[PDB]
């Protein structure tokens, strides 16, 4: 969790392993796909709310109607200032939530592994675990997916 | 054995701003603001516009002796004017409710 | 000759993004005018490679 990855692809959140069966990055499709849904729905909501169907053709007034021009000018300027503020505030506010949203997902995934990966694996802090039992691909993918066989292994316990 | 957790980080250079951080790089982003224009007025929605040219609306409606070509065309989508038309009301005078005519004539097709 | 959905005195937009800042005045279905120079939405994570 302390430092991103570059070799990994096809997923925002993924695992790693160094077992003799083979070393290579992997992605959590279930976790990443769920996150994408919120982003797609979040960006869509912004577009839908910001309607744009209206008439914006400008008008002109003669010299004796200076009051109209100033009043008409204020209306145009007023709305542009409001929309500019609203557009930035919504975009800036939503970005912060998205950045925090990912942190919860990755952190939540990390805790989920901890629950499924009981004390048999030693935690070294830097987003990694050390196993007290030798495990092959069959067991490695057990931790990656939603099925684990904790009672089978009780080495060093 | 050993298992580690991490997140994707490509070599993108997209800069975004948030409530209290500026110039933070992100892996992926979507651009919502468009600032590119063809810089070339042309037909819209399959119907050509009315290029008034050197004649303003006042000259067009009154039928100025110049810019006779405007008479032939009678269907358009929008009206475009030169910033400083030079063939308006040829005979000097005051055009009553000239501004109010534009609003009436603006919506015509 | 063009087929742009929106027309602007400075030209045509030719795209369907929600926002634009080329010119306040528009004809037909056009993106809303925003005075902000630039704005973006983050879809991924913060990029902090090590």
């Amino acid at each position: 969790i302390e430092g991103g990855w570059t070799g990994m692809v096809d997923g925002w959140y993924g695992y790693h392993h160094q077992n003799e069966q083979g070393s290579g990055y992997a992605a959590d499709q279930k976790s990443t796909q769920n996150a994408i849904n919120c982003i797609t729905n979040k960006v869509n909501s912004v577009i839908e709310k910001m309607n744009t169907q209206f008439t914006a053709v400008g008008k002109e007034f003669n010299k004796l109607e200076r009051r109209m021009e100033n009043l008409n000018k204020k209306v145009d300027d007023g709305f542009l200032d409001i929309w500019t503020y609203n557009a930035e505030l919504l975009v800036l506010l939503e970005n912060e939530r998205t950045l925090d949203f990912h942190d919860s997902n990755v952190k939540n995934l990390y805790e989920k592994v901890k629950s499924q990966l009981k004390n048999n694996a030693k935690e070294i802090g830097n987003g990694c675990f050390e196993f007290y039992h030798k495990c092959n691909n069959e067991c490695m993918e057990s931790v990656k997916n939603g099925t684990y066989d904790y009672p089978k292994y009780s080495e060093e316990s | 054995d050993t298992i580690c957790i991490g997140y994707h980080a490509n070599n993108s250079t997209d800069t975004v701003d948030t409530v209290c951080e500026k110039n933070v790089t992100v892996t992926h982003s979507v651009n919502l603001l468009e600032d590119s224009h063809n810089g070339k007025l042309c037909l819209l929605k399959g119907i050509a516009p009315l290029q008034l040219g050197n004649c303003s609306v006042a000259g067009w409606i009154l039928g100025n002796p110049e810019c006779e070509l405007l008479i032939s065309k009678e269907s358009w989508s929008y009206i475009v004017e030169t910033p400083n038309p030079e063939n308006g009301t040829c005979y000097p005078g005051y055009f009553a409710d000239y501004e109010e005519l534009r609003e009436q004539l603006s919506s015509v097709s | 000759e063009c087929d742009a959905k929106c027309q602007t005195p400075q030209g045509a937009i030719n795209s369907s993004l929600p926002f634009q800042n080329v010119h306040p005045v528009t004809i037909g279905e056009c993106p809303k005018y925003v005075r902000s120079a630039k704005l973006r939405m983050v879809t991924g994570l913060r990029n902090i490679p090590s």
Partner: antibody
Amino acid sequence: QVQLVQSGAEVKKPGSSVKVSCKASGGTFSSYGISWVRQAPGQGLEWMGGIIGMFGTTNYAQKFQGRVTITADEFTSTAYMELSSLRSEDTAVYYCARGGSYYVDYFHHWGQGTLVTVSS
Amino acid sequence: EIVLTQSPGTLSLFSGERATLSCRASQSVSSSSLAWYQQKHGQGPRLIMYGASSRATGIPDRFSGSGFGTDFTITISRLEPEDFAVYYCQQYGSSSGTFGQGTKLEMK
């Protein structure tokens, strides 16, 4: 409910490039993976390649590996084609498919398809 | 992507009786790397199965499939004239995909 729509049928001279655009009804921002498949006349289908969600990672079969390029404008929910170096054997039908997830897994949404033929 | 073997496509049978379709993968693949599509002449394919054990939405109980590694095969509980078509098997290990030649299913 969603609908997949592709461009109209086209015919191209041999040795040229043909582009086909795939779009989804109500094509707002989308991240579903896309791919392509060829159905030669009277023969079975064969995969071509596809995109992977936001990451924009592209994979193609080794048969060509240089002749087909796919890029998707996710904002408009559109997938394009840049097939090049068409030949007589390439006369077949191209279909647009989605997998329902950002990955390139199995497909369960199909468009109406497009018939492209090559001749003088 | 990986080559897939196929048995002879001559499978003639009548409706209303158990039917089987043969599709063999050259090498063992993940159980979640299989699917099935139904195509009739003149129209595009249609989903049947995904994951080799899960039936797609809007599919009756007349379709079943099983197999692991290389013995992949499917069966039809009760064949119907509309359900008769040419069936294609998909294999997708990771970031790839493949299809079969196509069985020559027929009515006597």
